[PDB]
Design a protein around this ligand. Structure first.
Ligand SMILES: [Mg+2]
Lengths: 97, 49, 49, 710
């Protein structure tokens, strides 16, 4: 959170990266922090947080182990998104009925 | 339902569902939830005639 | 009683299937809500809010 | 109650208030973060779920810890302070120095395992008794030689302040630290403090094996929940949701008996010798009619007779299955014979032995008809009915013919058959295993599950298939990961009751540990039941044989335990009497010699000089005597009690004061206590041995031979 606040303070108002976000076009300050700030915490395959943060940012480039631990939740989301639609459709069908 | 009546229980159901949807950042007009709820309380149970 | 139609901005017309509209409006954003854990085992996740 | 004690209590209360203020601040921060994460996370779904669940877990943990935050305090030999409570609170501004230690933290280990003989670098252990966000009081124990200036409600420091003390510490440590993980029988004469040692022992055992028993639960049995009180006050995470309490009349779920049977029917009902009776009882219901029962079939005049009924019940007995389970064999054999005979009767002339597809076809028709024939079902209900334990016991007790046939003595007959005493509870439970379950079919619930699965499958079929996908690239679909059954189960209620509720409502629950206070009172059948309920054989058995009042109670631990753990159970006995004045033991030994020429009186330290006093009461002054006794002891510190038969309004019955201690104890008219049942003398002994400071007696005509000393 502190790194995100510092990133928001530092950026000029007219910078294109922050200009896109502040204009309501795309993205969040979270994505900007992950890009130029720090990636932060990532989750185990079992969903728990890994106490070691990814202090590197994609601007700087992630180390090997940081990238490997980051892959976990990245792959988990692929199945999570597919699974959520099942529950959404269940509730929708009940409501339609 | 037993204490306050059909009106108040319908209001309570709408309030609770909209509380859940508002906490999660979803905006749905109350009339849709009311349309759903109105069908939940369409029946009366009989004991004698 | 239903009142202004959200899509047209005018009073709802006779014959409009408001029920399906309400069902779709309530169901479509369901994917944004939190859900029960998809993990097969473990403790009941409903103990926490 | 010292003024400095009040000052220390106020200081501790202020410290706990500060801890609760920090807890409130943390909860407010967690709630704010949780709301923000739920609303506008802005990240990926998996990350949102992770943060939301972590915050929810933190909030739930804080809410749980809100009740009774701090258990106590430890004073280290380096003069430090360590606060033990339900949460770990640290000063983030002072290098995270611990303000409160989670009871599971390693440095909090001594609070549970330290003893006066092996102090783990601690000098004082302080317990706080809390009713909420407030400390009601605190009690301290010195891990070493006491001095008497310390304030504890149990008075252990003062009593031990009044080397023999070293041997007391060594014995208590030996009992407490025993790494037996088995059946431990702790025994001790009154005034020795077996309750304190048992509480410390159970605390140590539960702490050291918490991981192994966090799921199984702990059962507590005794006349009072005091042990559960201590467990809850030192292990709330286990006491509140995992522990269970039961009286011997409350073993059966749902049922709650309190009436007690006569001292002879209870004895027979409290011994395994009655088990053979119970079987006979369920064998007595294998009735065969005295007269043939017409089938009254639609077309044929078939009938059943004692011959075929005898053969059928003989076969069902030969099967060896329980009653409601062998019903299947009995009905099948009866149906076989009746169908053979009926088909032979219908098959006249046109059909004699056309076994293939003609004789067998008529057998099929006859069975299909008979299985739904109302009279046949009524007959099979009259013969070999389905029984519950109550259906067995009520009829057995009432008939007075079934008792004679089964070999049961007439000491236990009653017209009010369904009036249950605490002695009937174990028999009622054992009848569950003897009768068995009918093994019925739950068609309705199965149909409900089928319909839910069908709806879930329809929901899955409602989604877009892989062939029709319009997305830029192929991707996982819901149908690839979840099946109809999983989705249907996902939306069920899936009740999640607590263990303290889940186990108490299940007659067949196996507990991880069993604690038995006043265990000498349990009958052999109660021990059978408890051992059935604890296959791990992990028991903390506390009691004293010489204080027994029930007739079915234990007379020797070996006779009760050797049937289950021969030689494997460990016996520990406490020798020194210090909590009661030696003058009390002087008369207690005299009352105790009545049961053994030598018995085993404990040696008594701490003679007080304040002799017990006995008073003659005549001309309607006994009620006065007790009135001025209570009026005097009201203003003389501590707690006081009067013990006598309920015929006197102002006395607690001796049975109720079994496990308590008091400063001033008055016992009224021991002559009636002696005559109460077969164990009246024992009652007197118990009533005498509850006094720690002052003992008074009221007698009508003259002191009984044993009580002539005071
Ligand atoms: Mg696309």
């Amino acid at each position: 959170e502190e790194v995100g606040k510092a990133l928001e303070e530092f950026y000029p108002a007219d910078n294109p990266i922050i200009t896109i976000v502040k204009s309501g076009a795309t993205g969040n300050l979270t994505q900007t922090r992950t890009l130029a700030g720090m990636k932060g915490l990532v989750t185990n395959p079992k969903g728990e947080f890994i106490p070691r943060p990814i202090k590197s940012s994609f601007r700087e480039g992630l180390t090997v182990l940081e990238y490997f631990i980051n892959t976990h939740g990245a792959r988990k989301g692929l199945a999570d998104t597919a699974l959520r639609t099942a529950d959404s459709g269940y509730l929708t069908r009940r409501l339609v009925d | 339902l037993r204490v306050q009546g059909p009106r108040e229980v319908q209001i309570h159901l709408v309030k609770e569902v909209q509380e859940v949807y508002r906490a999660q950042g979803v905006s749905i007009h109350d009339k849709h939830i009311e349309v759903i709820v109105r069908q939940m309380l369409r029946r009366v149970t009989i004991i004698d005639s | 009683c239903y009142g202004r139609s959200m899509a047209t901005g005018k009073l709802v017309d006779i014959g409009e299937a408001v029920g399906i509209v309400a069902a779709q409006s309530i169901g479509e954003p369901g994917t944004q809500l939190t859900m029960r854990t998809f993990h097969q085992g473990g403790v009941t996740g409903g103990a926490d809010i | 109650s010292g003024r400095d004690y009040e000052d220390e209590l106020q200081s501790e209360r202020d410290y706990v208030a500060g801890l609760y203020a920090r807890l409130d601040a943390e909860r407010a921060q967690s709630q704010r973060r949780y709301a923000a994460a739920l609303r506008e996370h802005g990240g990926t779904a998996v990350e949102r779920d992770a943060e939301v669940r972590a915050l929810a877990k933190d909030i739930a943990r804080l809410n749980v810890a809100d009740n009774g935050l701090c258990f106590g305090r430890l004073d280290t030999l380096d003069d430090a302070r360590l606060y033990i409570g339900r949460l770990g609170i640290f000063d983030r501004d002072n290098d995270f120095e611990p303000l409160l230690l989670d009871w599971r933290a390693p440095m909090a280990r001594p609070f549970y395992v330290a003893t006066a003989a092996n102090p783990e670098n601690m000098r004082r252990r302080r317990q706080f008794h809390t009713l909420g966000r407030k400390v009601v009081d605190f009690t301290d124990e010195i891990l070493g030689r006491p001095t008497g200036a310390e304030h504890d409600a149990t008075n252990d420091a003062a009593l031990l302040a009044a080397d023999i003390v070293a041997t007391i510490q060594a014995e208590q440590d030996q009992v407490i630290r025993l790494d037996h993980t088995g059946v431990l029988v702790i025994e001790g004469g009154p005034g020795t403090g077996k309750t304190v040692v048992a509480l410390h022992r159970v605390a140590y055992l539960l702490y050291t094996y918490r991981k192994q028993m966090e799921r199984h639960g702990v059962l507590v049995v005794g006349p009072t929940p005091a042990f559960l009180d201590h467990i809850g006050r030192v292990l709330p995470s286990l006491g509140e949701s995992d522990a269970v309490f039961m009286t011997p009349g409350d073993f059966v779920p749902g049922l709650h008996v309190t009436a007690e049977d006569t001292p002879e029917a209870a004895e027979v009902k409290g011994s395994l010798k009655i088990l053979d009776v119970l079987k006979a009882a369920v064998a007595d219901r294998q009735e065969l009619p005295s007269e043939p029962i017409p089938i009254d079939l639609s077309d044929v005049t078939m009938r059943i007779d004692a011959e075929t009924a005898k053969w059928a019940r003989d076969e069902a007995r030969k099967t060896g299955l329980p009653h409601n389970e062998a019903r299947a064999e009995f009905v099948d054999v009866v149906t076989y014979v009746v169908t053979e005979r009926a088909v032979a009767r219908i098959g006249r002339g046109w059909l004699t032995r056309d076994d293939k597809h003609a004789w067998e076809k008529m057998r099929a028709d006859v069975v299909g008809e008979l299985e739904d024939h109302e009279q046949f079902n009524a007959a099979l209900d009259a013969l070999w009915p389905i029984l519950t334990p109550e259906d067995v016991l009520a009829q057995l007790y009432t008939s007075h013919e079934r008792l004679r046939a089964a070999g049961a003595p007439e000491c236990l007959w009653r017209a009010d058959g369904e009036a249950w005493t605490v002695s009937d509870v174990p028999l009622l439970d054992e009848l569950v295993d003897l009768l068995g379950r009918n093994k019925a079919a739950d068609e309705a619930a199965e149909r409900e599950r089928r319909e839910e699965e069908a709806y879930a499958a329809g929901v899955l079929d409602l989604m877009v298939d892989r062939e029709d996908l319009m997305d830029d690239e192929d991707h996982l679909l819901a149908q690839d990961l979840i099946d109809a059954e999983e989705l249907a189960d996902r939306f069920k209620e899936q009740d999640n009751r607590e263990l303290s509720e889940r186990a108490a409502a299940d007659r067949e629950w196996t507990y991880g540990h069993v604690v038995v206070d006043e265990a000498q009172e349990l009958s052999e059948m109660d021990w059978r039941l408890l051992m059935r309920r604890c296959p791990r054989r992990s028991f903390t058995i506390v009691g004293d044989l010489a204080q027994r009042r029930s007739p079915a109670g234990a007379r020797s631990w070996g006779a009760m335990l050797d049937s289950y753990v021969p030689g494997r159970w460990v016996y520990k006995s406490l020798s020194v009497n210090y909590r009661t004045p030696a003058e009390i033991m002087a008369v207690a030994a005299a009352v105790l010699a009545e049961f053994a020429p030598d018995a085993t009186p404990p040696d008594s330290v701490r003679a007080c000089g304040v002799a017990p006093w006995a008073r003659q009461v005549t001309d309607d002054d006994i009620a006065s005597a007790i009135a001025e006794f209570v009026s005097e002891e009201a203003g003389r510190e501590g707690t006081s009690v009067v013990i006598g038969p309920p015929d006197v309004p102002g006395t607690v019955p001796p049975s109720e004061t079994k496990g308590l201690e008091f400063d001033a104890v008055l016992v009224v008219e021991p002559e009636r206590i002696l005559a109460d049942g077969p164990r009246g003398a024992a009652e007197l002994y118990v009533a005498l041995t509850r006094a720690t400071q002052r003992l008074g007696v009221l007698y009508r005509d003259a002191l009984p031979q044993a009580l002539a000393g005071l």
